[PDB]
Subunit: 313 residues, 3 copies
């Protein structure tokens, strides 16, 4: 459909700084051009200027709470605008803590949205269950209504308001979940397909079940938050926390081709691309190239081929 | 069954020259010996001496039309002979434009043949839809009856006569199809399993459907045209146009083991192996070794093991 | 459950010596610590001191028969003890010939055990069918009751007594089976899932069928003999006889996660890890790291996550 690109050069949700270059390398790879090369109407809303917050000491164990909270607050506003302009928001990250603002802004315009979270992690730790203190591993806890009451008043997030229920989200690709996160998973009855379920059923059945689970009762807007470390590091090595045994390039493209075909993609996040972590220049291009491929699939690029509504013969 | 090896050291169907060494490196890898090590009766018809055609300017955008057309005409003759000798033709390429002659010669003796095309590409561009002008991306358009009338009179192909119908061919492995090619696919109702279908159904279901689609009504001779770039470049890197997200080594062996089990393999093509494109000596041996493995599976080599009709205990 | 670690630094079942360092590198990787980090009660029975047998000339073609036979005899005793102590035996190899002693000792305490053999090889050659003479490719022939009578009196194995029937074992991962071995497979009706069956059905169906085949009639103790070369060499390169087209990291973890869930794991073997064969230091850590991952899955480590029986919120 119509696209609204939003750059989110933010890294304070985790320790490694290079992730704020994600928007830069993705654009430099010709993402806007490639999208236009397709039947896509693209409007670049530019990179959000995330002001520096010098005074931002930890809230207990949680690091850079004000910087993270403000960045998501700013992003939520931009996403809500692009959604109001009738465009599918495409947020280029940036660490995953930004999901808080992206999904929040998306839900302001489309409260009935459903979320598909592709990631090796659940990122559902609360400020009290986290052991790392990195906010990119907590975005989901801030968004779930069932958890409001388990989230302390962390500086920078007073603007947040839980917008989704445990049943409005599906996880795909999980392979490194913390104990508390697993407890929340089972306690709230969240639907997930860890790498174990992908191995058992095959990605085809996984997507069939995912889309049926989220669109069964009725059709609703879909928000896809894609963490590049959800895919195996043999495809996306330049990322902060890679975990072996990931989703293949093919599975990544399958997930997105299927989501595109629903015609319900409403919001998209391409997160955790960190060029500074590429062991080689090739590891960087390999990661960025895969990230672009996944993005293009979300907007119609199909492996069986594509053609214009004309008679080619 | 009984085998008839035919070397086709030809490269003019595309730009990179090293592909004409395919027969050489495949034989040097001990292909004939390995085949004989099995219950295989092998006769080497040698490498076809493709005469040089100095005067061969492009037909519009199409390059080396006379060289390509003549090479396929010569090959068609050799294949028809080996088929008449009651042997399964094994053509070692060489670029894929040779498929025109291999399938044409095969159909002269067995007009009811069915084709399984393993490739990342459909190679069904016509001389008028192609944008590259490389004939290795057009062989199928010359063979389909439904397209006769959309193929101009290109110098070197006046001998061609469409021998198969849209319904006599199945594609497996597609992941880089041109717009016009996709239009032809949908327009003629051609059966295909792109990498998307392989991901969705699994290679087992894909082969079950492929063989049922082609052998359902009745048993008929099978022609397998195997383009090595159909497999992922992590297995066959030394090829002209590699595309990531390909068929795995295992899937390649599965396809061929299943085709062998039909007992209907009649013609085989092992194409696009280009040693000159191996970034390293290991990339070359890796490509050639995989090509040999695929070939041996076509003739009985099974992963579960093989044994003679004797009492080993 | 409760674990009993047994080190088996033995290599004489094959030619390459570095495999006797397996216990060392696996322990150095923190296996005991990692296991304890889980709900696991671990007791290290140390490394069995395999005395040197200077006089050990070949029995016909069979090499180091006395050294191999004695090593398995010693291991059988240790395994029987750990089993009597109510612990799941975890044997760190060492070449696979040790399976003779591990399964023999296990069956002394649990005669109704069932065996799942993960390997690229069947290791079911008899002293008379083998062409290599390496005993690590014959362990299964010594254990099968149906073959007692086809096994000559080899020096060092007079203590052996066939403890399992052809129907008490299932193979997974086969891709390099000798002719005689295949003859035995078909002759005795042994249940196997070669890489061809894994491709056809998917690992989920494979495990479903495997566990149903072995636990259908009734629940019984399970012995898992895991040869690391069962997995693709892209995951476990430091091994004596690697064969491409192997089980993936994910499939390896799936097999073991499923076996763990049965709650019937009784005996485990982690064999063929040879650090000396790692082309690089990274190939060594890659092999050892994968071996540890497989082991941890056998004892509860799940990809969807794990959590204590407490309220994390
Ligand atoms: N990159 C990620 N998630 O996507 N890291 C999260 C890791 C860990 N679970 C935490 O809370 O710190
Ligand atoms: N190697 C191949 N096909 O197998 N190249 C074909 C590419 C392109 N579709 C063309 O017509 O030029
Ligand atoms: N590493 C192994 N098996 O696990 N080698 C066995 C090879 C061969 N089948 C033999 O009997 O020598
Ligand atoms: Mn992640
Ligand atoms: Mn994440
Ligand atoms: Mn191709
Ligand atoms: Mn081709
Ligand atoms: Mn083995
Ligand atoms: Mn073995």
């Amino acid at each position: 459909r119509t696209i609204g690109i939003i750059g989110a050069p933010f890294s304070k949700g985790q320790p490694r700084g290079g992730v704020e270059e994600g928007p830069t390398v993705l654009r430099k790879a010709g993402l806007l051009e490639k999208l236009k090369e397709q039947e896509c109407d693209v409007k670049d809303y530019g990179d959000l200027p995330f002001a520096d917050i010098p005074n931002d000491s930890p809230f207990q164990i949680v690091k850079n709470p004000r910087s993270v909270g403000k960045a998501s607050e700013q992003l939520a506003g931009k996403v809500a605008e692009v959604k109001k302009n009738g465009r599918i928001s495409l947020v280029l990250g940036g660490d995953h803590s930004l999901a808080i603002g992206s999904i929040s802004g998306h839900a302001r315009v489309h409260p009935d949205l459903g979320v598909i979270w592709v990631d090796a992690h659940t990122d559902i730790n609360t400020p009290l269950t986290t052991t790392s203190g990195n906010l990119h591993g907590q975005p989901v806890s801030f968004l779930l209504k069932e958890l409001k009451g388990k989230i302390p008043d962390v500086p920078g997030f007073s603007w947040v308001t839980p917008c989704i229920s445990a049943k409005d989200i599906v996880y795909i690709g999980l392979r490194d979940v913390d104990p508390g996160e697993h407890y929340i998973l089972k306690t709230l009855g969240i639907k997930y397909f860890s790498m174990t379920e992908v191995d058992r059923l095959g990605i085809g059945k996984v997507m069939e079940e995912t889309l049926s689970y989220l669109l069964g009762r009725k059709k609703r807007p879909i928000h896809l938050s894609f963490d590049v470390d959800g895919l195996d590091p043999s495809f996306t090595p330049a990322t902060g926390t890679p975990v072996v045994g990931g989703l293949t390039y093919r599975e990544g493209l399958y997930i997105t081709e299927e989501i595109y075909k629903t015609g319900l993609l409403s919001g998209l996040d391409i997160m955790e691309v960190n060029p500074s972590l590429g062991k080689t220049p090739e590891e960087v291009t390999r990661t960025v190239n895969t990230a672009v491929a996944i993005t293009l699939a979300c907007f119609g690029l199909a492996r069986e081929g594509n053609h214009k509504p004309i008679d080619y013969l």
